[PDB]
C-alpha cells in the first residue's frame, strides 16, 4: 500500500562460502511512505579503485 517496509538484523559471523545455519528473527527497521511500483531492483557495491 505504498509503504516500503524494511526489517533487519545485524549479527556477527565467522564464515566462508555459503550462509550460516541458524535462526534469528529480524526486527522492524523503517516503514517508508514512498508510493511507487518497484518491480525490479539492483544491488549497489563499492569498488577498490586504486
Amino acid at each position: 500500500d505504498g509503504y516500503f517496509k524494511i526489517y533487519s538484523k545485524h549479527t556477527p559471523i565467522n564464515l566462508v562460502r555459503d550462509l550460516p545455519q541458524g535462526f534469528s528473527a529480524l526486527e522492524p527497521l523503517v516503514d517508508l511512505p514512498i508510493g511507487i511500483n518497484i518491480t525490479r531492483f539492483q544491488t549497489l557495491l563499492a569498488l577498490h579503485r586504486s
Binding site: 516500503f4 514512498i34 511500483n37 518497484i38 518491480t39 525490479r40 539492483q42 557495491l45 563499492a46
Partner: peptide, 22 residues
C-alpha cells in the same frame, strides 16, 4: 562493500524509483 539498493521499474527517468544508499 555493499552500500545500497535501487528499487524501481524502468530505471530510466520516466518513472520514479527509490534509491537507498549508504
Amino acid at each position: 562493500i555493499i552500500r545500497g539498493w535501487i528499487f524501481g521499474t524502468t530505471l530510466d527517468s520516466k518513472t520514479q524509483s527509490l534509491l537507498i544508499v549508504n
